[PDB]
Amino acid sequence: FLEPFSADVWVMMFVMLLIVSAVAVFVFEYFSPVGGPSFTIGKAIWLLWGLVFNNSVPVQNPKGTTSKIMVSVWAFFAVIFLASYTANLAAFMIQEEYVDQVSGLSDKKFQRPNDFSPPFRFGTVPNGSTERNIRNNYAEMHAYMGKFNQRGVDDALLSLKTGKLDAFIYDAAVLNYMAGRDEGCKLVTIGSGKVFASTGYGIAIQKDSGWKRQVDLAILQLFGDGEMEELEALWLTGICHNEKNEVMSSQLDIDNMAGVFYMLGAAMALSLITFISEHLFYW
């Protein structure tokens, strides 16, 4: 909600412009022949500042003619301010971007899953290179994924959709293809493609054989000729790799709006500071 209106504007709006208007209105009334209790500077403020907030509050308008004109000028500012607050707020939420849930394999959800919310359910297809890496490096993680071991990518993607799992650890190339081909684009890879233990796919030629050099040279020719750039589009691309797929709707929750409750929760605090302070003025 604070995103529109750079903080200089808020201060200029309501520290400088509101006070200078209130003291002018309270002085426009002072000299009015016509000018019900007397108009004060604490009544101009309560009036000039509820006008900004859609006039919903009770107020006490002035009686002078030139005092009503200044209030009308301010009430035009309050229309422009509120119109341009909502408009930029809607703009700030129409073009928003998706924020992920997991940082990576170094997240506390993976290393220490027990001492958290209902335990994270992550697993991997065993008997592979990914299980070997987790066995060596993340020794404590590996024992935890034993209860969530899957049988294949196809089975493991199903458990993610139903809810039996919430994180599948596997090869990037396979997982990237599955994410692109997925219906609804509801399976994503954390980091927008972040890869750990970055290796590649090779051709396991026989040890100490004369074909290794020729196969290496032949592969590197495909990169130069662009042949390998055509195979990625023909075989590996998907429909969920398009843009504008990271901007969706969102119900506003307490967490998104917990900032507007802290200002209300600080108003209760500040009011109680003043409330105690006033008693310290009566003594």
Partner 1 sequence: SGQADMIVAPLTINNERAQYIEFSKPFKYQGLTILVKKEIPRSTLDSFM
Partner 2 sequence: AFLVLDRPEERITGINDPRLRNPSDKFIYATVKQSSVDIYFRRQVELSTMYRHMEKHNYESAAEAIQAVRDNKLHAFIWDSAVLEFEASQKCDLVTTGELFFRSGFGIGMRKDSPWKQNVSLSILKSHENGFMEDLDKTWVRYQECDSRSNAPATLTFENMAGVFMLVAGGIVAGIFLIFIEIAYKRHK
Partner 3 sequence: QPFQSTLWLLVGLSVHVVAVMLYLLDRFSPFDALTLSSAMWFSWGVLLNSGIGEGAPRSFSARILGMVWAGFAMIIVASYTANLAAFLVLDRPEERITGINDPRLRNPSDKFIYATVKQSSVDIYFRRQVELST
Ligand X SMILES: CC(C)[C@@H](O)CC[C@@H](C)[C@H]1CC[C@H]2[C@@H]3CC=C4C[C@@H](O)CC[C@]4(C)[C@H]3CC[C@]12C
Give the residues across from 167 on adjacent strands: 122
Among 15, 57, 87, 270, binds partner 2 (CB under 8 A): 87
Q: Does 233 bind partner 1 (CB under 8 A)?
A: no
Q: Does 266 bind ligand POV (CB under 6 A)?
A: yes
Residue 79 near residue 72, CB atoms below 8 Å: no
Least separation in angstroms between residue 113's CB and ligand POV is 23
Least separation in angstroms between residue 113's CB and partner 3 is 26
Question: Judging by DSSP bridges, how do beta strands 122-123 and 167-168 pair with one another?
Answer: parallel
Residue 110: name the closest of 196, 10, 175 by CA.
196
Give the residues across from 168 on adjacent strands: 123
Q: Does 224 bind partner 1 (CB under 8 A)?
A: yes
The DSSP annotation for 72-119 comes to HHHHHHHHHHHHHHHHHHHHHHHT-----S---TTSHHHHS-SSSSS-
Among 16, 42, 108, 199, binds ligand POV (CB under 6 A): 42
Tokens, residue 166: 């919430």
d(CA 185, CA 179): 7
Q: Does 20 bind ligand POV (CB under 6 A)?
A: no
Least separation in angstroms between residue 48's CB and partner 3 is 10
Q: Which does 200 bind (CB under 5 to 8 A by kind): partner 1, partner 3, ligand X, none?
A: partner 1
Residue 150: name the closest of 162, 139, 138 by CA.
162
Contacting residues toward partner 1, per CB under 8 A: 80, 84, 198, 200, 216-217, 220-221, 223-224
Query: Interface residues with partner 2 (CB under 8 A)?
Result: 3-6, 8-9, 12-13, 17, 20-21, 24, 28, 31-33, 64-66, 69-70, 73-74, 76-77, 80-81, 84, 87-88, 90-92, 94-95, 97, 133, 136-137, 196-199, 220, 223-226, 228-229
